[PDB]
Amino acid sequence: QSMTYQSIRLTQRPLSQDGTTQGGTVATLTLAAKMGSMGPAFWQEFPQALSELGDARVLIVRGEQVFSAGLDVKSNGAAIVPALGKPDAFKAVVDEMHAVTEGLAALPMPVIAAVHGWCIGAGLELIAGADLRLCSQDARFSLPEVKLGITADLGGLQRLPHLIGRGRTAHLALTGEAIDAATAERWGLVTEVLPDQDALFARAEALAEHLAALPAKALEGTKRALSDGLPHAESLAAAVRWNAEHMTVEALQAG
């Protein structure tokens, strides 16, 4: 069962297609605009698609020709340019874009970004909020915002240092130049590199099947702890409280 939006496609595959029960799905969100570009429709539709994921155990995010060329400068310029030099108006504009990056990062389930070819700018900021990142050999990653006189402000400068370190983030962000798949894996931006797009998509599906087999609330608590940004003792105490609420005798016995 698929839902076509203007800028994206969302498909959900029932994990059991037999049985008389309502269970979970694996969701796949495809960036479907030209070169996976992000225009004004994207900022409106992506959060709508996220609201459809109440039943989903895992979300895969992927592209078509490439993953994403990032922000479409031309089509977003209509909203951005009139707000330049107006901090409150400018914030309001970027708030719509944060609905995507912060919305994805806040999803309670595992999110797998499966990247082939170009992953540029807002594309890279988006995957920075995913839980697991996989790519193909041909994948190339960059944050070229500086070349346009832009400071990356969709969460890349905050999230990327947790993944690859501050120095390596500074390399990407200050030079604006791309890194290849082998480098991304060395740096910890991705945890697997596959031969090609088809191998990538197959592996993402398999990884999703693996995660969907695991207890949903343990995955959620783990994600919460890693993303909480709380001091050690507070983050620790919150994980303990999560287990108090969500551990079951049954999950112990089954595992």
Place this chain on the structure above:
Amino acid sequence: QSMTYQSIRLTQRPLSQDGTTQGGTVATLTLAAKMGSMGPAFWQEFPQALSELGDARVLIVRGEQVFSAGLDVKSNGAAIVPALGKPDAFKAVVDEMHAVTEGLAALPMPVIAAVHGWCIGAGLELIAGADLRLCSQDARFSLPEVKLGITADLGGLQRLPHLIGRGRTAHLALTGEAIDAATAERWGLVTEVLPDQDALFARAEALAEHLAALPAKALEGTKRALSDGLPHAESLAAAVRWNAEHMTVEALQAG
């Protein structure tokens, strides 16, 4: 001179066995339960052993057949299951386990974890609190708690991202699958990989000898600064204050 507990063995080797002076030791704590498992005795005895380290300059933590299989599900179930769904009671239970992980992390001297074979779950959380980690070629590391419906709550989700990055921690914690020694070294979880268990233990002893030769309070201040979790300026100011109190003319001249 050795102390036998039920779950662990603690041995301390005087650094000078000649001389009429009371100096320092190298302490070795061996996880001595079956497969280095951690049951109710472990949580009681491990902090007791730590209280014996007033004279020790370095602590080595190691296993026997393997490093540690982690929590013994069966023997801890007696305490855990009755506390499920009761946040204050559950906290009290896990507090006893934190006495080990937080206790180890708080030790004023260098702690070397020397890992061979399996290092699983609470085993991995424990070494995350050590200062230096060494392993053999055959070592395998995992955080499989998710498979039991558990969110790792002994400090692994807080400590591991400082060592290997958030993305790599998410890989371990969400998939629950193991990584090998070569991967651990690439990721920064360990800083040396040795051919085998005997080579590992010998190297740990040698590294301990090296550290024990260094000024104790400089090692302590360094550990304090790295672990303080304070904002930059506060952490910096505290290191300066530590030097004001602990630097000596003699240590400058000797070095």
Place this chain on the structure above:
Amino acid sequence: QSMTYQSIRLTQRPLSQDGTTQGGTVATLTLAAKMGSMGPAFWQEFPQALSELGDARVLIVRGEQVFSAGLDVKSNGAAIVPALGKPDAFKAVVDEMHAVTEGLAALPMPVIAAVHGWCIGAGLELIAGADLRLCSQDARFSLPEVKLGITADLGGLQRLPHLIGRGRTAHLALTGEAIDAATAERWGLVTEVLPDQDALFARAEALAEHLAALPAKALEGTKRALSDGLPHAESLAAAVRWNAEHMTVEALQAG
């Protein structure tokens, strides 16, 4: 046009030597004391040189025979020893040294550290505050302060974990032993290793030319965001505000 100080040399190269306009420069600061050592003159002169950089688009920091042997123990002892055991007096002494490390870290433009040969102690702490680090094959990096009974307190223990991770910083800081160029690159301390000193200096110049071609305020905002140490949402909101103030139609069109 060069400025000779006692401990350093500062040269600034106009980016356009044609034209009737006052533009930007590439600045090169050379550690010019014996083995790039840092004595009392260094702490006074280095901040003076930084005050000369109002027109500079990029700063390169480099050495001569080596990058830096770090603190000259003998010549700083006159100020340090009388302040031992006196927290307020000791702070005052180290404040003069922080004027260098914190001053460099606060510079609004990109700072490139170009390291050949030894980079030791305060030398390593200094480059930890740079934006990009390049080295030659022969470069060796260490934090041997522990051997002198010193806890590194010029920002290395705070900055290095952001670059290479806490475990790897603990290796350097606790053992006091050096790492080579290949290891530094693997660890993320540097992002390029060049064959030799001449190749290093040439590449640093080229990288500076590349960065100087980019919009100055986007580079500044990027540096601010990466270094702010603020919680996620605050750091994010501050980047958005920076763009509101500094993005231009012209920079979009040009890029």
